């Protein structure tokens, strides 16, 4: 229908102003995200220097461990509850909401709350990720420049809010492709056509990523080395593993949803018990972060160690269980901060474990557990969040093990296929569902 | 629509188990078809090289069996297209794009044999054409056919199995799974309205397709380029400059192919016999060139590792670029079966290499390697002619494994699309589809 013929001849003509403004969004979200990340790090730092100041009296130092974190945690629970509730939890359900035009981007409130609130809960050493925070911060940045410059239209509101969020993923993980992919596979409205210019999201993601490289060059977030290739007669192991991730995904999805409810009892909704709960979780974490640091924190540190088979089978069973616990706690409590990255650490440990059984069950295959570690790494993403293409492309950008691309994709699909066949749902879709339903009811 | 949204969010990613199993089937068949296509094209280029040795003395006799061998295989492919499947002329990407708009018909009983055997002619003869088009149309048609055969009803199913055939078709062509999946969701899928295409199922298609390729292609890369040097932040501004160069060149290239499409239409007028004859003449020029200056002819994949590695003179790069622009325009604008996608990789590499060269001398403080610019230029003519930058970026990544080049690769790609937008240019597949949808009415 000729309408088409007119459309094909007018394809990819993004309004110059939407382009130039993406340049500024990415830049700002870039610096913001760098600053966030540098911030978080500095406080985990001080906490380490304070444990040295009191390095002798074991119960004293077990106390300043708890307290430095407990206090920082409360500052974050508080800052959210008092000024910006939409900035509790992840921030991706929220930004997805915004692109649907079913949630308000209150940038004058969320930027400072999420930034300094994230700073506390993360910097205190809680099991939460930078992924939600940075995407929320970035969409808000993008909304804020839309306002300030008074850009009018649907395309301008949707695009700038989108490039903002891709750039915030790009910057937090040094993952320009994964940034771009997360917008198209998860973030943009899933059930209707939208006017989100891709070339504009790209530009935003470049400037965001460059900013990261100005302040972070020479050191990568994960360094795993170059691992062995994967023989064709080995793949069916990767299928079995994605199946294991694909049954676990939904179960872990039930648990985050339920535990949200069961933590919502403890405080009833009340800013004083809610802040006091948060600093108990906060204290528990900063305490865990000294007596068994692998059960606490973001968990990036234990990834290269798991991938190189440097853990024993027991330690991995612990670390995994310990972390399912400290993940549900930290995230289902309402604290500002994601579940995304802490899934990276869970996916890795699960894999490495599976690889270890493969190595001893099939020595003819000449296996390396680190190759199951790397396929598992983003399998939880694929199985819970249900965004496999982004899960895969992200791990690719962080490990540089491209010869593993088939094992990674097979574990991915095996994950998303069993998640779907066991009634699980996209977690960030479930959360935005819960929030829209509790809204009109 | 808040209540419809809650209903919809909770019902997300629930692809009908039937469509998932079929994507598996489409994958596998496309994979095999792509491998068979790849091996068949290779066997003819090889026989042809066997004949040249059979006659390796008498130069004019050998310059003659060089011509006739291509000429015959060319005609045979032109003929099969004009006689049974006109839609299988050109690339086959505009076509499967049409089919995704429900504006073009997937006549798989006629296209599979025409595209396959007629591509085998034009590529195997040694013409300048890519595998991407052919294996994409082929793959989508295979998709259609398992749709018909199994009588799957749905709008989902038709678009899905049509999309997983195109994706499995690009994946198996380049050993590039990610590139295939991404080509669908950036370029192939209908651009101006919502659609019911399951990505999960396209994924399964792509997996199976790539596994088939690995069963019959293991241990030997399409492009080995080795690991190259990194790129420092103060190098970036140079890639942006290279993107811009591509960005103004992209559209200029696009006009020639459209133009050359017309000017060649005059030589035959529509006539199956001049067209076949002309095709066999073009063909014979290529098979001749393939012996007397091989880098000016054929797929291009051979001279990519060479260029990336600095082994060409600036005089050779300039020579190869111009002759190749010329022969790529001859072959694709003549409407033989075969795409323009892959030969744009080669053109791009060469152009970048050339730039890397001049960047190396002009700035020894930077410690450059021409090959980092060759690699950022590989998927750049893609960026500015075909305007699918996320695809050529992930494509090149998958084929050269040089991830540390990600920033310059992006940057150059973006630079290309922006200057391609800004100077009037359109997506090439979209402008070919359009000229065809418009012709659909022109004679009314
Ligand atoms: F996160
Ligand atoms: F999260
Ligand atoms: F091609
Ligand atoms: F093509």
What does the model show?
Chain A has 441 residues and is mainly alpha-helical. The first copy, chain A, has a single domain (1-441), classed as Clc chloride channel (Orthogonal Bundle). Helix content of chain A is 72%, strand content 0%. The first copy, chain A, is built from 19 helices and no strands. The first copy, chain A, has helices at residues 3-8, 16-53, 58-83, 92-100, 107-123, 131-148, 154-173, 176-187, 198-214, 235-267, 271-291, 302-307, 313-332, 340-361, 369-376, 379-383, 388-399, 405-420, 427-437. In chain A, helix 2 (16-53) runs antiparallel to helix 3, helix 6 (131-148) runs antiparallel to helix 7 (154-173) and helix 15 (369-376) crosses helix 18. Chain A is globular, with a radius of gyration of 21 Å. Chain A starts with a helix and ends with a helix. The interface between A and B is large, with 65 and 63 residues. Bound molecules: fluoride ion (F) (4 copies). One fluoride ion is lined by residues 90, 132, 338-340 of chain A. Chain B: One of its GO terms (cellular component) is plasma membrane. Chain B: It comes from Escherichia coli (strain K12). Chain B: It is found in: Cell inner membrane. Chain B: It catalyses: 2 chloride(in) + H(+)(out) = 2 chloride(out) + H(+)(in). Chain B: It is a multi-pass membrane protein.
Question: What is shown here, in short?
Answer:
The structure is a homodimer. Chain A has 441 residues and is mostly helical. Chain A is 72% helix and 0% strand.
């Amino acid at each position: 229908r000729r309408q088409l013929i007119r459309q094909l001849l007018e394809r990819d003509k993004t309004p110059l102003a939407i382009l130039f403004m993406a340049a500024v969004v990415g830049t700002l979200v870039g610096l913001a995200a760098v600053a966030f990340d540098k911030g978080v790090a500095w406080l985990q730092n001080q906490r380490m220097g304070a444990l040295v100041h009191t390095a002798d009296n074991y119960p004293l130092l077990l106390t300043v461990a708890f307290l430095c974190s407990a206090v920082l945690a409360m500052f974050g629970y508080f800052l959210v509850r008092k000024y910006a509730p939409e900035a509790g939890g992840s921030g991706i359900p929220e930004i997805e909401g915004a692109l649907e035009d079913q949630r308000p981007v209150r940038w004058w409130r969320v930027l400072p709350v999420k930034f300094f609130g994230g700073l506390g809960t993360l910097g205190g050493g809680m099991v939460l990720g930078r992924a939600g925070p940075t995407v929320q911060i970035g969409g808000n940045i993008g909304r804020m420049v839309l306002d300030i410059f008074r850009l009018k239209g649907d395309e301008a509101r949707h695009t700038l809010l989108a490039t903002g969020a891709a750039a915030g993923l790009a910057a937090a993980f040094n993952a320009p492709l994964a940034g771009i992919l997360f917008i198209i596979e998860e973030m943009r409205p899933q059930f209707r056509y939208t006017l989100i210019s891709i070339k504009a999201v790209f530009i935003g993601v470049i400037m965001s990523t460059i900013m990261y490289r100005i302040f972070n060059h020479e050191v990568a977030l994960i360094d795993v080395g170059k691992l062995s290739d994967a023989p064709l007669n080995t793949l069916w192991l990767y299928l079995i593993l994605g199946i294991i991730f694909g049954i676990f995904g939904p179960i872990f999805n039930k648990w985050v949803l339920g535990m949200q409810d069961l933590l919502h009892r403890v405080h009833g909704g009340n800013i004083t018990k809610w802040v006091l709960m948060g600093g108990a979780i906060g204290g528990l974490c900063g305490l865990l972060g000294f007596v068994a640091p692998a059960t606490s924190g973001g968990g990036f540190n234990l990834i290269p160690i798991a991938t190189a088979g440097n853990f024993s089978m027991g330690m991995l069973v612990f670390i995994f269980v310990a972390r399912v616990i400290t993940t549900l706690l930290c995230f289902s409590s309402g604290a500002p901060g994601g579940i995304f990255a802490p899934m990276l650490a869970l996916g890795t440990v699960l894999g490495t474990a599976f690889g270890m059984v493969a190595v001893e069950l099939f020595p003819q295959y000449h296996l390396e557990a680190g190759t199951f570690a790397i396929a598992g790494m983003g399998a939880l993403l694929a199985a819970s969040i249900r965004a496999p293409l982004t899960g895969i492309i992200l791990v690719l950008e962080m490990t540089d093990n491209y010869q593993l691309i088939l094992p990674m994709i097979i574990t991915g699909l095996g994950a998303t296929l069993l998640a779907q066949f066991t009634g699980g749902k996209p977690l960030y879709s479930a959360i935005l569902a819960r929030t829209l339903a509790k809204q009109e009811a």
